[PDB]
A paper describes a structure:
The crystal structures of apo Mtb PanD and the Mtb PanD:POA complex were solved using molecular replacement and both structures were refined to 2.7 Å resolution.
PanD is a proenzyme and in the structure, we observed the processed active enzyme after cleavage between Gly24 and Ser25, and modification of Ser25 to a pyruvoyl group (Pyr25). The active protein consists of a β chain (Met1-Gly24) and an α chain (Pyr25 to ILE115).
Residue numbers in the entry:
A (entry chain D), E (entry chain D): 25 to 116
B (entry chain C), D (entry chain A), F (entry chain C), H (entry chain A): 1 to 24
C (entry chain B), G (entry chain B): 25 to 115
Write the structure that this text describes.
């Protein structure tokens, strides 16, 4: 895979090659792949390769990354949650 | 004891393109 | 995603954002998502977003969390198992 | 060497609601 | 979930509550659940709850557990691989 | 750097029973 | 499971028993299994057991391994990417 | 805090064989 606008990767704290779960709100598909850095500020969310069978252009998706962390850190950790407009630009 | 926790979420993004035969 | 009654989260030792596996007894669906804290004592089990395609209101579900732990602790660890009535209240 | 172990289980809960278009 | 004969759990180095992947040779189903200790020497392989939708009595299954381990240990670690007869008894 | 490795495999076991409505 | 040519395993930094994700470009199947060392230089990509239901001879596949690593290493880590010809020989 | 990162990829390999009833 999934090409993500570098702005959304920074906003979401995702690295190139970090494991990502994609869930499709339109068809209910769920898959695991990895993040590729996309052209900054382009609003690109690009499905590459085998995933294109399951996730289609115009589908609304949720992109999720998880981390393993000790009990103490888990209770205090604040996850980076990025809401976006119809053009994939971050919102308040 | 380590827990698996949500760290990142991009909520309701729109898929812009798809290429079955991508090489990269 | 899954909104869980804060009482069930405390009972089951789940944090907000902890990864959760939902298995559906009614339709056999199995998915991975994360826990959101729901109104305490409401008995809420709310499926949010894409998961709602697979897991439906009225379905009986099992919610499961796993942990990574060293060999030594794994052999002794006692999991928190929460039984609930038809109204999602602990027993 | 880390094993993945069951830590939590809520057994036979009833799904009360669902929202396809949830924001949060 | 999956109830496993304690002999197979010892043979395979599985603990009660350890995460297990079941793959179904008959129908191609793949699911993740956890091990429950079954009556020793009974040859029990019991599918409990939601999994019964996917994995059926008489199906041939493979039960798999994975571990996270440092590079050095990964190169030397010997996995415990248990072959069984039609009655779920260990074989040489 | 940690790898995910096979540690256990029970090869070609026969499912003996199934109970949709198990409680335990 | 998946039997891989020892050359591709060395090229991709995979050990026998390392967890591998197979994604099928032809039918969109996605599964998790582990690597078995195949005859070196044979170009073998062999699907063994239950996986054979989903991933078929002649299919184009991507084989993926993931690693757990501390924040610091994750930001600098360079993955091993192996391109292959139609005969499964590295480039 | 551990991230899961891509470490290995064999891109567009051709499946040569398959055995439903493999023993090993």
């Amino acid at each position: 895979x999934v090409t993500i606008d570098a702005d959304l990767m920074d906003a979401a704290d995702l690295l190139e090659g970090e494991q990502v779960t994609i869930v499709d709100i339109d068809n209910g598909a769920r898959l695991v792949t990895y993040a590729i850095t996309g052209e900054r500020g382009s609003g690109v969310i690009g499905i590459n390769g085998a995933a294109a069978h399951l996730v289609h252009p115009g589908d609304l998706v949720i992109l999720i990354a998880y981390a393993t962390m000790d009990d103490a850190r888990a209770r205090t950790y604040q996850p980076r949650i990025v809401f976006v407009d119809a053009y994939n630009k971050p919102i308040d | 004891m380590l827990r698996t926790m949500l760290k990142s979420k991009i909520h309701r993004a729109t898929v812009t393109c798809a290429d079955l035969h991508y090489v990269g």
